[PDB]
Design a protein around this ligand. Structure first.
Ligand code: FE2
Ligand code: FE2
Ligand code: FE2
Ligand code: FE2
Lengths: 126, 127
C-alpha cells in the first residue's frame, strides 16, 4: 500500500497543489485514520514531511509510479484491451512487475507508436 | 495463496505425478499444510475437487486455463526481451490480476511476433 499512497499523494499535489488527508482517504477508499497511520510511516521512511510535502525521495518515486501507471494503460490500450477493463487491469499488475518488464513494455509501446502499420498488422491478427 | 494459485499447482501436480499430495502442494506453494487442507476443503465446497485429491470437470477446466495463462505470459515477457531470470516471478505476480480480455489480447500479440521474425528483430532494434 506504500506505493499506492505515494502515487496518490503525488497525483493530488500535481492536481491541486496539496494533499489533504480527506482527499487521500477518498481516492484510496479508506478511513482517514488509516491515512494518518500510513503518513506517519512515510514520514519515518523520509518520503514526506508535514501540510503534506514530498521529499525529493518521495517525489522521484511518485513520478516513477505515475509513469508506470500511464505506460501500462497505454500498453493495454495499444494491444486493444477494452478501455473499460484497462484501469482495473493496470492497478492489479502495476506494482508486481520488475523494472526490466516495465522497461521492455516501454520499448514495445514505442515499437507500435513508431509506425502505425505495426498497429494495423496487430489488428489484423485479431 | 489465492484459490487460483491452488488450482494451478494441483492441476500441475496431477499432470506431473498423476496425483496431488497435500505435502506436495504445501511445498509447491511454500505454505504450511494447514493453509492447504483448509483451502482444499474450500475448493471441495465450491465443487472444484473431491477427496486422494481428484479435480471435478470444473476444476480441470480452470486448472487447464491457469496453466495456459501462466505459459502464455511467460512467453510474452520472453518475446519482448525480459531477462529470463525475472520472468517467473513477474508472471506469478500478475497472472491472476488480468481480465480475460487482457490475456486474449496478449495472446494475439504473441501470435503477432510469432508469425514474422522481422517483427522480433525490429523490436530488438528499438531496445
Ligand atoms: Fe497498487
Ligand atoms: Fe496506478
Ligand atoms: Fe496468483
Ligand atoms: Fe502461475
Amino acid at each position: 500500500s506504500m506505493e499506492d499512497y505515494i502515487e496518490q499523494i503525488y497525483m493530488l499535489i500535481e492536481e491541486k497543489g496539496y494533499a489533504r488527508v480527506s482527499d487521500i482517504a477518498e481516492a484510496l477508499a479508506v478511513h482517514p485514520s488509516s491515512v494518518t497511520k500510513m503518513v506517519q510511516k512515510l514520514d519515518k521512511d523520509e518520503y514526506l514531511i508535514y501540510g503534506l510535502v514530498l521529499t525529493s525521495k518521495g517525489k522521484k518515486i511518485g513520478k516513477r509510479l505515475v509513469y508506470r501507471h500511464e505506460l501500462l494503460e497505454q500498453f493495454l490500450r495499444i494491444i486493444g484491451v477494452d478501455e473499460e477493463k484497462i484501469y482495473n487491469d493496470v492497478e492489479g499488475i502495476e506494482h508486481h512487475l520488475s523494472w526490466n518488464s516495465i522497461d521492455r513494455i516501454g520499448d514495445l509501446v514505442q515499437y507500435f507508436e513508431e509506425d502505425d502499420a505495426r498497429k494495423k498488422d496487430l489488428k489484423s491478427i485479431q
